[PDB]
């Protein structure tokens, strides 16, 4: 079957700047290569076909050049909606194959968290459970750390955090920290805190709450 | 209009099978072909075969180990793969795509959802995320809410019945004892909350199930 | 009117359909084999002219049982028809010129 | 004459696993490559013939896979009857020419 090598794996731009994705084909395939957009969570979406077709409704940002073996993806002046997976694709020879994928990252400026603490809810103490969820939000760098105090002491345990995919709104990064326990360890306990601590500031960024 | 129609999500026992459909709409020529591609967690795009249903012949990948069988129906417009005996191994979304004979996939499905797994549906829980009474507010405030206890993958969250766009991240679910647990999060202006409401809406196909949750102040 | 050129003209509506049938009929046989180029409809409408011709240039060509049968099949039919519109002018060409001598 | 290179020249698999024997030839052959399984003692078998067609009385645990230079004779859960010599062999072009050989290992 054709190969399709696709490297860099990961392409880091600025805002504005034109970017060129590889993509190698192990041999000759005139310019039968097809490209596709995959945002996070999304189906993919053809953007070029052979190699340099425009597709209506794609901005006209995109565009394709290449022939033989050696082919490219091209973005004039990179925005926040482009930050996704892309994929070429090949149809000279059965069976269609796909390369393996460049991711598009985006350099923008730097970004302090927004944080916010949330209480459980009642619907939820009902059910004997306690959730205490801590958003971390819209920041820049991606790299960051979570703390969680309860009346004072540093918790640990029943921790579970997420953290998203660069966001294609703004190109932030954002983390939520969830400490669950049941409704008598949440009982036992009267203040509840969260510290995040990111490069914008030597201090942490602290929010909490007391269950009265 | 929404060319080509699948469901969100199938669960599986080890060893089970699943049939997946995929029905196409809009212009249909005896040249279309309908291509499966499989996607793991991560992971790239896999070809695993086309059918061409004006004629039935189906190709497969020679590469990976044959678990699909595809078939079409040419009355309701359906498309069909069989995969059976299934392990973790193929757990995944599975694309399906249209093409017009021509080497492209124009358009694709939405995917479906494959878990392979011997536990048993559940669906979330959905709790409410409002500030408590010391929080203090900006111009904007955020809200969000908690969808917790479910299987399998996905829940499919939006806010305002989609009206509700800009502000919104939804975190991936995190798996603890065969159990999912996500939080989305929504951030609109202060002023307009709780004069203008503010909703979540938590789609769970594995379960048939979508609920509502309304976002008011706490007391 | 005159068989030859009723035969013609029939000569190139069957050609026509011929290439039409017989690109669609080689993307079916060729796709499935790994290695195979003619897997996309209007490149093997293009490979089913120049084979009709017989100009075969060797940018495409089958490579299985059936995409083969139908390649025979489409230079049958591409040789026989040119073959055809020679025959219905020398018919044309000798009947004139028995009429330009008096016959 | 056609160089079939088969490396690795030893494959170590546990039992039950999906195993890949690897066959590149020094130029482009279509699918004129064909599988031979030699246990100890024995003569060579014929598994697989143009790349990936079974023959009758091969279990179906045996597929291959490939075209151009490039080809894999796969097995889906190695059992150990399966302990083996394997080599390829290449039809396109005078003279036929066989890989070196893989052995399998459990
Ligand atoms: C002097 C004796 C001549 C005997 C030749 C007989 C070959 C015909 C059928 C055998 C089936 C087979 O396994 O061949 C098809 C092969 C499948 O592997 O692919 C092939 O490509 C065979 C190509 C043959 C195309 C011939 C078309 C002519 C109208
Ligand atoms: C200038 C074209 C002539 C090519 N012909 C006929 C064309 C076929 C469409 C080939 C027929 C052979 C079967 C004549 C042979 C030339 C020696
Ligand atoms: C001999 C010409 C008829 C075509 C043979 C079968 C067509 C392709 C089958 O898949
Ligand atoms: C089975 C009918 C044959 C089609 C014509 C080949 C071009
Ligand atoms: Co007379």
Redesign the pocket.
């Given at each position: 079957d054709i190969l399709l090598t696709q490297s860099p794996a990961i392409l880091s731009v600025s805002p504005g700047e034109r970017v060129s994705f590889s993509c190698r084909a192990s041999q000759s395939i005139g310019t039968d290569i097809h490209w596709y957009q995959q945002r996070t969570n999304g189906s993919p979406r053809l953007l070029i076909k052979y190699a340099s077709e425009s597709i209506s409704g794609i901005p006209s940002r995109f565009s394709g050049s290449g022939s033989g073996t050696d082919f490219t993806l091209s973005i004039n002046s990179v925005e926040s909606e482009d930050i996704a997976n892309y994929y070429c694709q090949q149809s000279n020879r059965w069976p269609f194959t796909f390369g393996s994928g460049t991711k598009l990252e985006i350099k923008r400026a730097d970004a302090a968290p927004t944080v916010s603490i949330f209480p459980p809810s009642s619907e939820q103490l009902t059910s004997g459970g306690a959730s205490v969820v801590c958003f971390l939000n819209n920041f820049y760098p991606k790299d960051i750390n979570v703390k969680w105090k309860i009346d004072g002491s540093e918790r640990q345990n029943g921790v579970l955090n997420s953290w998203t995919d660069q966001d294609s709104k703004d190109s932030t990064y954002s983390m939520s920290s969830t400490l669950t326990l049941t409704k008598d360890e949440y009982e036992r306990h009267n203040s509840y805190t969260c510290e995040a601590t990111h490069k914008t500031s030597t201090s942490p960024i602290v929010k909490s709450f007391n269950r009265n | 209009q929404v060319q080509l129609q699948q469901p969100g999500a199938e669960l599986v026992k080890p060893g089970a099978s699943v049939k997946l459909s995929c029905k196409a709409s809009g212009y249909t020529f005896t040249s279309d072909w309908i291509h499966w591609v499989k996607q793991r967690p991560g992971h790239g795009l896999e070809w695993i075969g086309e059918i061409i249903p004006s004629y039935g012949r189906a190709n497969y990948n020679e590469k990976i180990q044959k678990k699909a069988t595809l078939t079409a129906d040419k009355s309701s417009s359906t498309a069909f793969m069989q995969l059976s005996s299934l392990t973790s191994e193929d757990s995944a979304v599975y694309y399906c795509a249209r093409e017009r004979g021509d080497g492209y996939f124009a358009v694709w499905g939405a995917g479906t959802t494959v878990t392979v797994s011997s536990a048993k549906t559940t669906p979330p829980s959905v709790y409410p995320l409002a500030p408590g009474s010391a929080a203090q507010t900006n111009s904007m405030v955020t809200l969000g809410c908690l969808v917790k206890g479910y299987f399998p993958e996905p829940v499919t969250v939006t806010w305002n019945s989609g009206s509700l766009s800009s502000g919104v991240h939804t975190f991936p679910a995190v798996l603890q004892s065969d159990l999912y647990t996500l939080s989305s999060s929504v951030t609109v202006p202060s002023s307009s909350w709780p004069s203008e409401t503010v909703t979540c809406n938590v789609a769970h196909p594995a379960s048939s199930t979508k609920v509502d949750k309304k976002i008011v102040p706490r007391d | 009117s005159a068989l030859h050129w009723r035969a013609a003209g029939a000569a190139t509506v069957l050609l026509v359909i011929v290439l039409l049938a017989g690109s669609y009929l080689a993307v079916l046989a060729e796709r499935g084999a790994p290695g195979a180029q003619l897997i996309t409809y209007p490149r093997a409408l293009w490979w089913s002219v120049e084979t009709?011709?017989?100009v075969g240039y060797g940018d495409l060509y089958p490579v299985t049982l059936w995409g083969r049968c139908v390649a025979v099949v489409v230079?049958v039919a591409?040789?026989t028809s040119?073959?055809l519109v020679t025959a219905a002018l020398a018919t044309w060409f000798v009947g004139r010129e028995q009429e330009r001598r008096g016959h």
């Open positions: - | - | 009709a011709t017989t230079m591409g040789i040119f073959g």
